[PDB]
Design a protein around this motif. Structure first.
Motif, PDB file in Angstrom:
ATOM      1  N   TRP A   1      -1.309   2.129 -23.901  1.00  0.00           N
ATOM      2  CA  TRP A   1      -0.932   0.815 -24.689  1.00  0.00           C
ATOM      3  C   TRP A   1      -1.614  -0.476 -24.474  1.00  0.00           C
ATOM      4  O   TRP A   1      -1.407  -1.478 -25.148  1.00  0.00           O
ATOM      5  N   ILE A   2      -2.497  -0.558 -23.322  1.00  0.00           N
ATOM      6  CA  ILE A   2      -3.136  -1.428 -22.754  1.00  0.00           C
ATOM      7  C   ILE A   2      -4.434  -0.775 -22.366  1.00  0.00           C
ATOM      8  O   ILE A   2      -4.726  -0.967 -21.382  1.00  0.00           O
ATOM      9  N   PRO A   3      -5.315  -0.818 -23.472  1.00  0.00           N
ATOM     10  CA  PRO A   3      -6.698   0.044 -23.345  1.00  0.00           C
ATOM     11  C   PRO A   3      -7.434  -0.492 -22.131  1.00  0.00           C
ATOM     12  O   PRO A   3      -8.123   0.371 -21.205  1.00  0.00           O
ATOM     13  N   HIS A   4      -7.489  -1.854 -22.093  1.00  0.00           N
ATOM     14  CA  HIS A   4      -8.460  -2.336 -21.029  1.00  0.00           C
ATOM     15  C   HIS A   4      -7.704  -2.978 -19.742  1.00  0.00           C
ATOM     16  O   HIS A   4      -8.132  -3.855 -19.054  1.00  0.00           O
ATOM     17  N   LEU A   5      -6.579  -2.481 -19.521  1.00  0.00           N
ATOM     18  CA  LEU A   5      -5.993  -2.879 -18.394  1.00  0.00           C
ATOM     19  C   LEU A   5      -6.738  -2.483 -17.047  1.00  0.00           C
ATOM     20  O   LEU A   5      -7.557  -1.475 -17.128  1.00  0.00           O
ATOM     21  N   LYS A   6      -6.613  -3.493 -16.161  1.00  0.00           N
ATOM     22  CA  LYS A   6      -7.246  -3.467 -14.846  1.00  0.00           C
ATOM     23  C   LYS A   6      -6.180  -3.422 -13.724  1.00  0.00           C
ATOM     24  O   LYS A   6      -4.933  -3.492 -14.278  1.00  0.00           O
ATOM     25  N   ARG A   7      -6.368  -2.592 -12.500  1.00  0.00           N
ATOM     26  CA  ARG A   7      -5.234  -2.296 -11.737  1.00  0.00           C
ATOM     27  C   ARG A   7      -5.875  -2.807 -10.357  1.00  0.00           C
ATOM     28  O   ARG A   7      -6.867  -2.880  -9.868  1.00  0.00           O
ATOM     29  N   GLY A   8      -4.762  -3.173  -9.530  1.00  0.00           N
ATOM     30  CA  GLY A   8      -4.836  -3.253  -8.106  1.00  0.00           C
ATOM     31  C   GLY A   8      -3.718  -2.348  -7.354  1.00  0.00           C
ATOM     32  O   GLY A   8      -2.601  -1.971  -8.127  1.00  0.00           O
ATOM     33  N   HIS A   9      -3.876  -2.033  -6.194  1.00  0.00           N
ATOM     34  CA  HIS A   9      -3.019  -0.949  -5.564  1.00  0.00           C
ATOM     35  C   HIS A   9      -2.815  -1.570  -4.179  1.00  0.00           C
ATOM     36  O   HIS A   9      -3.917  -1.550  -3.610  1.00  0.00           O
ATOM     37  N   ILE A  10      -1.798  -1.869  -3.642  1.00  0.00           N
ATOM     38  CA  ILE A  10      -1.436  -2.189  -2.136  1.00  0.00           C
ATOM     39  C   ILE A  10      -0.880  -1.108  -1.482  1.00  0.00           C
ATOM     40  O   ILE A  10       0.160  -0.806  -1.532  1.00  0.00           O
ATOM     41  N   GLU A  11      -1.541  -0.756  -0.495  1.00  0.00           N
ATOM     42  CA  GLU A  11      -1.059   0.222   0.614  1.00  0.00           C
ATOM     43  C   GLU A  11      -0.161  -0.373   1.527  1.00  0.00           C
ATOM     44  O   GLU A  11      -0.067  -1.698   1.678  1.00  0.00           O
ATOM     45  N   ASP A  12       0.997   0.242   2.026  1.00  0.00           N
ATOM     46  CA  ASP A  12       1.927  -0.113   3.172  1.00  0.00           C
ATOM     47  C   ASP A  12       2.449  -1.192   2.709  1.00  0.00           C
ATOM     48  O   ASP A  12       2.698  -2.151   3.523  1.00  0.00           O
ATOM     49  N   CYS A  13       3.033  -1.289   1.425  1.00  0.00           N
ATOM     50  CA  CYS A  13       3.540  -2.354   0.619  1.00  0.00           C
ATOM     51  C   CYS A  13       4.749  -2.032   0.085  1.00  0.00           C
ATOM     52  O   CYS A  13       4.883  -1.157  -0.778  1.00  0.00           O
ATOM     53  N   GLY A  14       6.021  -2.801   0.399  1.00  0.00           N
ATOM     54  CA  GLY A  14       7.117  -2.055  -0.280  1.00  0.00           C
ATOM     55  C   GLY A  14       7.389  -2.984  -1.681  1.00  0.00           C
ATOM     56  O   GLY A  14       6.523  -3.551  -2.092  1.00  0.00           O
ATOM     57  N   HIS A  15       8.758  -3.197  -1.966  1.00  0.00           N
ATOM     58  CA  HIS A  15       9.108  -3.956  -3.054  1.00  0.00           C
ATOM     59  C   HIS A  15       8.658  -5.570  -2.960  1.00  0.00           C
ATOM     60  O   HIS A  15       8.443  -5.801  -3.764  1.00  0.00           O
ATOM     61  N   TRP A  16       8.881  -6.007  -1.639  1.00  0.00           N
ATOM     62  CA  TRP A  16       8.896  -7.471  -1.632  1.00  0.00           C
ATOM     63  C   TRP A  16       7.233  -7.873  -1.526  1.00  0.00           C
ATOM     64  O   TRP A  16       6.846  -8.477  -0.464  1.00  0.00           O
ATOM     65  N   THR A  17       6.405  -7.580  -2.329  1.00  0.00           N
ATOM     66  CA  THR A  17       5.219  -7.684  -2.385  1.00  0.00           C
ATOM     67  C   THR A  17       4.415  -8.811  -1.748  1.00  0.00           C
ATOM     68  O   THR A  17       3.644  -8.988  -1.137  1.00  0.00           O
ATOM     69  N   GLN A  18       4.835  -9.815  -2.249  1.00  0.00           N
ATOM     70  CA  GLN A  18       4.382 -11.231  -2.134  1.00  0.00           C
ATOM     71  C   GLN A  18       4.197 -11.608  -0.585  1.00  0.00           C
ATOM     72  O   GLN A  18       3.550 -12.025  -0.186  1.00  0.00           O
ATOM     73  N   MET A  19       5.476 -11.335  -0.094  1.00  0.00           N
ATOM     74  CA  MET A  19       5.678 -11.421   1.212  1.00  0.00           C
ATOM     75  C   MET A  19       5.528 -10.253   2.354  1.00  0.00           C
ATOM     76  O   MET A  19       5.167 -10.597   3.375  1.00  0.00           O
ATOM     77  N   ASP A  20       5.416  -9.028   1.792  1.00  0.00           N
ATOM     78  CA  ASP A  20       4.695  -7.871   2.518  1.00  0.00           C
ATOM     79  C   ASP A  20       3.278  -8.085   2.675  1.00  0.00           C
ATOM     80  O   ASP A  20       2.999  -7.837   3.873  1.00  0.00           O
ATOM     81  N   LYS A  21       2.629  -8.145   1.689  1.00  0.00           N
ATOM     82  CA  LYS A  21       1.084  -8.194   1.700  1.00  0.00           C
ATOM     83  C   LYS A  21       0.409  -9.335   1.156  1.00  0.00           C
ATOM     84  O   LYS A  21      -0.281  -9.300   0.116  1.00  0.00           O
ATOM     85  N   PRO A  22       0.803 -10.554   1.640  1.00  0.00           N
ATOM     86  CA  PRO A  22       0.380 -11.880   0.867  1.00  0.00           C
ATOM     87  C   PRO A  22      -1.149 -12.118   0.912  1.00  0.00           C
ATOM     88  O   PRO A  22      -1.472 -12.323  -0.351  1.00  0.00           O
ATOM     89  N   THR A  23      -1.966 -11.670   1.807  1.00  0.00           N
ATOM     90  CA  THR A  23      -3.255 -11.790   1.713  1.00  0.00           C
ATOM     91  C   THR A  23      -3.733 -10.750   0.745  1.00  0.00           C
ATOM     92  O   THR A  23      -4.807 -11.354  -0.168  1.00  0.00           O
ATOM     93  N   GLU A  24      -3.477  -9.530   0.523  1.00  0.00           N
ATOM     94  CA  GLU A  24      -3.842  -8.715  -0.491  1.00  0.00           C
ATOM     95  C   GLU A  24      -3.608  -8.795  -1.883  1.00  0.00           C
ATOM     96  O   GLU A  24      -4.402  -8.990  -2.826  1.00  0.00           O
ATOM     97  N   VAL A  25      -2.292  -9.501  -2.006  1.00  0.00           N
ATOM     98  CA  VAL A  25      -1.983 -10.009  -3.460  1.00  0.00           C
ATOM     99  C   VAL A  25      -3.129 -11.205  -3.703  1.00  0.00           C
ATOM    100  O   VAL A  25      -3.466 -11.054  -4.743  1.00  0.00           O
ATOM    101  N   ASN A  26      -3.127 -12.149  -2.783  1.00  0.00           N
ATOM    102  CA  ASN A  26      -4.062 -13.208  -3.101  1.00  0.00           C
ATOM    103  C   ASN A  26      -5.391 -12.890  -3.497  1.00  0.00           C
ATOM    104  O   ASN A  26      -6.118 -13.178  -4.482  1.00  0.00           O
ATOM    105  N   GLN A  27      -6.001 -11.804  -2.467  1.00  0.00           N
ATOM    106  CA  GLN A  27      -7.310 -11.322  -3.153  1.00  0.00           C
ATOM    107  C   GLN A  27      -7.420 -10.892  -4.389  1.00  0.00           C
ATOM    108  O   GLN A  27      -8.421 -10.870  -5.141  1.00  0.00           O
ATOM    109  N   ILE A  28      -6.412  -9.829  -4.609  1.00  0.00           N
ATOM    110  CA  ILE A  28      -6.241  -8.973  -5.938  1.00  0.00           C
ATOM    111  C   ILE A  28      -6.218 -10.162  -7.130  1.00  0.00           C
ATOM    112  O   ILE A  28      -6.907  -9.737  -8.167  1.00  0.00           O
ATOM    113  N   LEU A  29      -5.336 -10.991  -7.145  1.00  0.00           N
ATOM    114  CA  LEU A  29      -5.219 -12.061  -7.989  1.00  0.00           C
ATOM    115  C   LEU A  29      -6.286 -12.823  -8.239  1.00  0.00           C
ATOM    116  O   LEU A  29      -6.641 -13.005  -9.539  1.00  0.00           O
TER     117      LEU A  29
END
Ligand SMILES: O=C(Cn1cc(C(=O)C(F)(F)F)c2cc(Br)ccc21)NC1CCCCCC1
Ligand SMILES: [Br-]
Length: 320
Positions: free
Chosen positions: A283-311
């Protein structure tokens, strides 16, 4: 840890989108507008580690209190929290701020919202990103009730249906509520799949939970203070429009999202599992992706550094 936010050091904005509905946000930075949309049961403050980082990277960040939360209005009526109404209000928000378009980044229910914004208001959405929440086209041949009953880990959503029940449990001891919810995957004291049987979220969980490694006591107390304002009725109402939302979504069927789009999955989110996102490129042909390991539901505070780098990588590239 990335730089965080002190509420009293922020710029606080307020836009009335309708009489008696006023959305609050914090605003930091200059540059292209980026609108952050939190999940349930959260706050602008859930983006505390992303707001400074995005501002520093050259963006004007608008971190919302979504309708129902914090200093935003929290009307009691369920239908005030259907996606159709919520999205239209976010368009009004942009209008009154004089913004032709923003990048929309959401997590959880806010993720659902930003997908809906990209689908129905692409002209207002420069680019769209979701943490954890996939884009699933509505299936007009299946009731939402069916779909929810067909997945054990969505059982809590049935518990959330009857107005008043989850409210009372969540409001009974706010510190207990947020300490119980905001935990890493390996620290979890709850099971989402066993809730209606048990009679509630916290019936088997500690009366006095320990503090997760992810959060401080001061951070918990901020959430406590925010949820004393309006409680959990408005937040829970986001879950009580499943038929209405499905009917609206069916109207968009066949349309593809062609604006820049990012889907970030979290390995250890056991409700919004990564595999739920697996067909999105249909549905979103040119979707891009990130994936964070060792990360639960509360993404932003579980893995803030990784979220920041991906975004930031995505913002500075695919999204422009
Ligand atoms: O329901 C949620 C949020 N959510 C609440 C959780 C709770 O523990 C609580 F008690 F608060 F309810 C919770 C726990 C995990 Br793990 C993941 C997500 C969670 N999000 C939906 C997911 C389905 C479809 C897309 C829209 C957003
Ligand atoms: Br989880």
């Amino acid at each position: 840890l990335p730089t965080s936010c002190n509420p009293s050091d922020m710029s606080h904005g307020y836009v009335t989108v309708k009489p008696r509905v006023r959305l609050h946000f914090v605003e930091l930075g200059s540059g292209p507008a980026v609108c952050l949309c939190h999940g349930f049961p959260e706050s602008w403050y859930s983006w505390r580690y992303q707001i400074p980082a995005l501002a520093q990277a050259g963006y004007r960040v608008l971190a919302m209190d979504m309708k129902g939360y914090g200093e935003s209005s929290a009307p009691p009526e369920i239908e005030e929290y259907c996606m159709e109404v919520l999205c239209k209000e976010m368009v009004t928000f942009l209008d009154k701020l004089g913004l032709s378009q923003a990048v929309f980044i959401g997590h959880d229910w806010g993720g659902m919202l930003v997908w809906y914004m990209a689908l129905f208001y692409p002209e207002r959405v420069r680019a769209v990103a979701s943490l954890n929440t996939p884009f699933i086209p509505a299936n007009p041949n299946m009731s939402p009730l069916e779909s929810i009953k067909a997945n054990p880990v969505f059982d809590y959503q049935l518990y959330f249906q009857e107005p008043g029940v989850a409210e009372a449990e969540l409001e009974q001891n706010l510190s207990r509520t947020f300490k119980s919810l905001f935990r890493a995957s390996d620290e979890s004291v709850l099971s989402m799949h066993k809730v209606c049987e048990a009679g509630g979220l916290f019936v088997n969980s500690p009366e006095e939970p320990s503090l997760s490694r992810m959060v401080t006591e001061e951070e918990i107390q901020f959430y406590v203070q925010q949820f004393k304002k309006s409680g959990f009725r408005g937040p829970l109402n986001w879950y009580r429009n499943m038929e209405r939302n499905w009917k609206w979504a069916c109207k968009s069927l066949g349309r593809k999202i062609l604006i820049p789009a990012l889907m970030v999955t979290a390995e250890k989110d056991f409700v919004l599992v990564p595999q739920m996102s697996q067909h999105m490129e249909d549905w979103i042909p040119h979707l891009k992706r990130g994936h964070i390991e060792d990360c639960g539901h509360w993404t932003q505070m579980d893995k803030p550094t990784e979220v920041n780098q991906i975004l930031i990588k995505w913002l500075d590239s695919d999204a422009r």
